[PDB]
């Protein structure tokens, strides 16, 4: 029992660093998706001055 | 090569523009013509043959 419960605690910590990596990657790829964003504009707009 | 700007933010959202004028911009069917209809813009008569 004290076993597996030390391991609970863990794995709650476990679990909270995984969040954390996620966390990172979600925050680059916001970064990479507002990068999208502007480049759809410059797409538009190479659309039109394309004429 | 038609004038085809953009007009929304997505596929086919376009309107295509024509132009054409010139000196050679009288009177025609596909060409303006020879003698006539092509010069009248260009060399109008009235240099001695009008009399």
Same mark, same amino acid.
Do not use: P
């Given at each position: 029992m004290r076993g597996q419960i030390r391991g609970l605690e863990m794995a709650s910590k476990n679990s909270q660093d995984g969040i954390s990596l996620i966390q990172t990657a979600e925050g680059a790829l916001t970064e990479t998706h507002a990068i999208l964003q502007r480049v759809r504009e410059l797409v538009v707009q190479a659309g039109n001055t394309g004429t | 090569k038609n004038l085809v700007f953009q007009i929304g933010a997505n596929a086919t959202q376009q309107i295509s523009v024509n132009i054409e004028d010139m000196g /050679?911009? /009288?009177?025609?069917?596909?060409? /303006?013509d020879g003698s006539i209809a092509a010069l009248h813009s260009v060399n109008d008569l009235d240099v001695t043959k009008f009399a």
């Open positions: - | /050679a911009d /009288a009177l025609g069917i596909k060409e /303006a």
